[PDB]
């Protein structure tokens, strides 16, 4: 069965475009897919179909500034003022669109890239449905967020011109490092995947519209959510639930595996239930890389089944 869910964003502007996919039979879990920056939720068709095959409900939206939400609003790569809180709020609102339908099922959030940061930030909030946490394309300790991005220059841009296009230098600082292991054949988005076909499709897909200029306030929202996802409060408040981590060892977003290992090591030192899948030689989208897609999906199904059993 299919549901179209729309709701007004926390930003008061966008009609958030959302879908729920129900399998035949009695489902055993809900999986919420939270897409990343410059993509959309219907890009996950293969994973959605795999999760339905496994007997799970799947629910996802196109976030503010993204995919169908942007197509219908006309506004790309901006989520309003307080962008981090807008997208966290909207992911919590999405959970409540199934209120009364699946109240006794376990709920797993799967978040990729920006979605991994949103999922991590949601975990710190009391209202959240979250019986397991699955992260992919994990943004953790990359040089740009950790060191290159000049917070004083960003604060100055926010004080004077928060709705202007993000200054080019600040965008370059935030993603400093993303091209470190790329050739000119790979192109500027080669970090997306080792698969040239995945990268070419990424650049073609009209519901990604990747590369639309971000506003200053949107860039502020990425710095904010990076802090919320990677800061002490995340580790201190992470609920006592199963966690799984998926990343490419060549993904700049996780500092080429080093950052993802640090996330796993800190959660494990504090006694958390942590499963780590680091794919050697693969880049950001390990759920789309032909080499790893089947292992990511099967691992995710086994993980959701383990959450449901507990």
Nearer of residues 27 and 36 to ligand DK0, judged by Cβ: 36
Site for ligand DK0 in 30-49 (CB under 6 A): 36-38
Q: Binding of ligand DK0 at residue 9 (CB under 6 A)?
A: no
Query: What track of x and - describes contact with its own copies for positions 270 through 309 (by CB under 8 A)?
Result: ------------------x---------------------
Question: Can you tell me which of 98, 253, 267, 286 binds ligand DK0, judged by CB under 6 A?
Answer: 253
Q: How far is 149 from 76, CA to CA, in rounded Å? A: 23
269 backbone dihedrals φ, ψ, rounded to 5°: -60, -30
Distance CA 111, CA 58 (A): 13
Question: How many other CB atoms sit within 10 Å of the CB of residue 8?
Answer: 12
Q: What whole-number distance in Å separates Cα of residue 23 and Cα of residue 46?
A: 14
Tell whether residue 144 is a contact of ligand DK0 (CB under 6 A).
no
d(CA 47, CA 49): 5
**Which residue from 7, 207, 210, 235 is in contact with its own copies, where contact means CB under 8 A?**
207
Residue found under tokens 């089947």: 294
Question: Which among 253, 82, 237 is positioned nearest to 90, based on CA atoms?
Answer: 82
Considering only 1-9, 105-113, 159-167, 259-267, which stretch makes contact with its own copies by CB under 8 A?
Answer: 1-9
> Is residue 186 classed as helix, strand or coil in its secondary structure?
coil
Does 92 contact its own copies by CB under 8 A?
no
User: Is 42 among the residues that bind its own copies (CB under 8 A)?
Assistant: yes
Q: Under the criterion CB under 8 A, does residue 43 sit at the interface with its own copies?
A: yes
297 Cβ partners below 8 Å, 6+ apart?
Answer: 46, 47, 50, 51, 287
CB-side exposure of 72: number of CA atoms within 13 Å? 15
CB of 38 to ligand DK0, least distance (A): 4
Residue whose CB is less far from its own copies, 261 or 293 = 293
Rounded Cα gap, residues 154 and 166, in angstroms: 9
Strand partners, 59: 20, 32
Count of residues that interact with ligand DK0, criterion CB under 6 A? 8
Which of 46, 151, 268, 310 lies at the binding interface for its own copies (CB under 8 A)? Answer: 46
Residues that bind its own copies (CB under 8 A): 1-4, 21-26, 40, 42-43, 45-46, 48-49, 52-53, 68, 71, 195, 197-198, 200-201, 204-207, 288
Residues that bind ligand DK0 (CB under 6 A): 36-38, 113-114, 139, 175, 253
């Amino acid at each position: 069965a299919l549901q179209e869910i729309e709701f007004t964003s926390h930003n008061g502007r966008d009609a958030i475009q959302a879908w729920a996919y129900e399998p035949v039979g009695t489902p055993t879990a809900v999986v919420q897919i939270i897409h990343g920056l410059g993509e959309h939720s219907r890009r996950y068709l293969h994973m959605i179909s795999a999760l339905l095959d496994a007997g799970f409900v799947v629910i996802a939206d196109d976030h503010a500034g993204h995919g169908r939400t942007a197509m219908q609003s006309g506004v790309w790569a901006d989520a309003g003022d307080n962008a981090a809180e807008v997208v966290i709020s909207d992911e919590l609102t999405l959970q409540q669109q199934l209120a009364g339908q699946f109240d006794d099922l376990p709920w797993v959030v799967f978040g990729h890239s920006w979605g991994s940061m949103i999922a991590r930030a949601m975990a710190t909030r009391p209202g959240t449905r979250l019986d397991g946490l699955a992260l992919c394309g994990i943004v953790a300790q990359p040089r740009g967020f950790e060191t290159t991005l000049d917070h004083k220059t960003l604060a100055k841009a926010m004080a004077t011109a928060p709705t202007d296009p993000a200054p080019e230098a600040l965008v370059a600082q935030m993603f400093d490092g993303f091209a470190d292991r790329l050739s000119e054949d790979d192109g500027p988005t080669g970090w997306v995947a080792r698969s040239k076909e995945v990268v070419a499709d990424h650049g073609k897909d009209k519901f990604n519209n990747f590369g639309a200029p971000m506003s200053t306030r949107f860039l502020q929202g990425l710095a904010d959510i990076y802090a919320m996802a990677n800061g002490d409060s995340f580790y201190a408040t992470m609920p006592n639930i199963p966690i799984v981590l998926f990343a490419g060892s060549e993904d700049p977003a996780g500092d080429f595996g080093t950052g993802v290992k640090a996330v796993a090591e800190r959660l494990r030192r504090d006694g958390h239930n942590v499963e780590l899948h680091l794919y050697d030689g693969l880049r950001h989208e390990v759920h789309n890389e032909p080499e790893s897609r089947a292992d990511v999906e099967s691992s995710l199904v086994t993980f959701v089944d383990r959450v449901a059993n507990r």
